[PDB]
Design a protein around this ligand. Structure first.
Ligand SMILES: C[C@H]1OC(C)(C)O[C@H]1[C@H](O)CNCCCn1cc(CNc2ccc(S(N)(=O)=O)cc2)nn1
Ligand SMILES: C[C@H]1OC(C)(C)O[C@H]1[C@H](O)CNCCCn1cc(CNc2ccc(S(N)(=O)=O)cc2)nn1
Ligand SMILES: [Zn+2]
Length: 257
């Protein structure tokens, strides 16, 4: 099965998922000098006031905080998007060291981690249908740098001990994802893909320019997770990021001058 080891990491994925070498793969390097301001982009609308978190799951690749997406309760609209995208889950990608972990890069700079808030287009009815469409998903990506603690992350950090290994879940109600956002909603956007298998080319990427700060202690707790199941050889869940893929025939647009 695919993963992030020497024997099953990103350079192997194309053998089971040939779209890995496709025309709109993610992540990518954001060359800030080449990205063009697009004055036609609308302001982003992040409406998370009625969000209903349910559960946190270690899926063997990351941990997902899952939401009730059976109604419009936490939605993303505006910016490059047509229509209404419902929040289904968020997760992170992170490194073994502070100098790597992000999937997207900015002028080849790697951040310590990257948050993905995953949303699906309500016109397709369910997430499984939406991932089969070129405009099915919108992923809001937020960089993490190490410095001051992020208070709104601590409830996530403190439950990780209870989902150490693959397949463990825990109740995770009443979590407010607004506490993970930076001050500014300035962004870059481009058409891309899921960054893990099945690597489907279904994503409008919206990557915020302003990183959030998390503490060294917060990211150290990420790095104590395990890719393995309980009672299997311990393999730390670190370096669960895909490197930048070729931009090909794509333009990255900026929401800001
Ligand atoms: C097995 C253990 O030992 C090693 C050192 C391999 O890693 C350990 C692992 O963590 C656990 N042992 C194996 C399980 C995980 N795995 C499988 C393989 C080789 N097959 C394989 C299949 C599909 C793809 S894909 N979908 O195209 O990306 C890539 C590689 N390599 N790892
Ligand atoms: C449903 C599936 O059920 C089985 C396994 C039986 O076949 C599958 C079927 O073939 C298809 N059914 C599943 C849904 C399709 N899908 C989605 C996912 C993971 N989503 C995901 C979300 C965000 C990002 S990121 N990092 O933000 O870019 C990366 C990955 N994995 N699959
Ligand atoms: Zn992701």
């Amino acid at each position: 099965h695919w993963g992030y080891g020497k024997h099953n990491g990103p350079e192997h994925w194309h053998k089971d998922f040939p779209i890995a070498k496709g025309e709109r793969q993610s992540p990518v390097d954001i060359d800030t000098h080449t990205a063009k301001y697009d004055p036609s982009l609308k302001p982003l609308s992040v409406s998370y006031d009625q969000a209903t978190s349910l559960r946190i799951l270690n899926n063997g690749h990351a941990f997902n905080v899952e939401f009730d997406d059976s109604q419009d309760k936490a939605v993303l609209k505006g910016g490059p998007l047509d229509g209404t995208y419902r929040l289904i889950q968020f997760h992170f990608h992170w490194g073994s060291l502070d100098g790597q972990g992000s999937e997207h890069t900015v002028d080849k700079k790697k951040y310590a981690a990257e948050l993905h808030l995953v949303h699906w287009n309500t016109k397709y009815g369910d997430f499984g249908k939406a991932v089969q469409q070129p405009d099915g998903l919108a992923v809001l990506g937020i960089f993490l740098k190490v410095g001051s603690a992020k208070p709104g992350l601590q409830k996530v950090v403190d439950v990780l001990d209870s989902i150490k290994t693959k397949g463990k879940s825990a109740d995770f109600t009443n979590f407010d994802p607004r506490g993970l956002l930076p001050e500014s909603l300035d962004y870059w956007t481009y058409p891309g893909s899921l960054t893990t298998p099945p690597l489907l080319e279904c994503v409008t990427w919206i990557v915020l320019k302003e990183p959030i700060s998390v503490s060294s202690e917060q990211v150290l707790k990420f790095r104590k997770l395990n890719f393995n199941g309980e009672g299997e050889p311990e393999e730390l869940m670190v370096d669960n990021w895909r490197p930048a893929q070729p931009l090909k025939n794509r333009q990255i647009k900026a929401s800001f001058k």
